[PDB]
Design a binder for this molecule. Structure first.
Ligand code: 0F9
Length: 267
């Protein structure tokens, strides 16, 4: 309220309205997200939005996830105070600017995404909306951060039959049956993400292309990378790699450190 100073609006959309801000007590940069109460389909716990439940569960120390520093309730909205890296650029803008990414950069990014998703999973949290728009690059440190847990859920081992993340990243089993399990669905979205990184765009726009699962490469991409991608994008959920299999894949060997990454690629 007076505990933060509000700057420019960063973005608005189905995640709410996020402003650039500064914590007055110690000038920490922050991002202040406002979500309207009647836009919240999903609540946990007094009653908070699921997004706050999920962020509290993952906001312990390891930094591949955006940290929730505080939250407030207002009469028609909740306000979430989040970390803000500075300078920062979301992966989607970064890809718009730079086109398809060199493999070495896509490997570093993709690895950090996997560490972040493993950490969420370990904390009992399923993101359900992994995509370039939901990933922030701290451009000085070369560290990626997962944001926008507003479509996530507690991780469980039984089937999910609800989804509200991004359709073009949702797996064929969700398209056809409205059913998925959390890990394998997460893995498919990671396949879409990785294709997006290396080709400069997502592979499928239409339901039919998702269902068909046939991957055409429009950029030059190494065989090992194409094979990882096709593996993550297996039609049968149980034919997809576990996180361990993805990180042990030959295309994932020799990842740059985040800091090396920023020096080489983010200048
Ligand atoms: O959640 C965020 C945290 C930090 C920054 Cl810089 C931005 C966001 C953000 C921007 C759109 N959704 N979430």
């Amino acid at each position: 309220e007076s505990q933060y100073q509000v700057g420019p609006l960063l973005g608005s959309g189905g995640f709410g309205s996020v402003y650039s801000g500064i914590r007055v007590s110690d000038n920490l940069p922050v991002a202040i997200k406002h979500v309207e109460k009647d836009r919240i389909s999903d609540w946990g716990e007094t009653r908070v939005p699921m997004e706050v439940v999920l962020l509290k569960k993952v906001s312990s120390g390891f930094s591949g996830v955006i940290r929730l520093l505080d939250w407030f309730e207002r009469p028609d909205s909740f306000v979430l105070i989040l970390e803000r890296p500075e300078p920062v650029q979301d992966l989607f803008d970064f890809i718009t600017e730079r086109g398809a990414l060199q493999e070495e950069l896509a490997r570093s990014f993709f690895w950090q995404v996997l560490e972040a998703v493993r950490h969420c999973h370990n904390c009992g949290v399923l993101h359900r909306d992994i995509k370039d728009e939901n990933i922030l690059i701290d451009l000085n440190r070369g560290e990626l951060k997962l944001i926008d847990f507003g479509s996530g859920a507690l991780l469980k081992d039984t089937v999910y039959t609800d989804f509200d993340g991004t359709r073009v990243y949702s797996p064929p089993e969700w398209i056809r049956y409205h059913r998925y399990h959390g890990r394998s669905a997460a893995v498919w979205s990671l396949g879409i993400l990785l294709y997006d990184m290396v080709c400069g765009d997502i592979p499928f726009e239409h339901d039919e292309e998702i269902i068909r699962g046939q991957v055409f490469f429009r950029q030059r991409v190494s065989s090992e990378c194409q094979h990882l991608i096709r593996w993550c994008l297996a039609l049968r959920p149980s034919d997809r790699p576990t996180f361990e299999e993805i990180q042990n894949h030959p295309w994932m060997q020799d990842v740059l450190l985040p800091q090396e990454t920023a020096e080489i690629h983010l200048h």
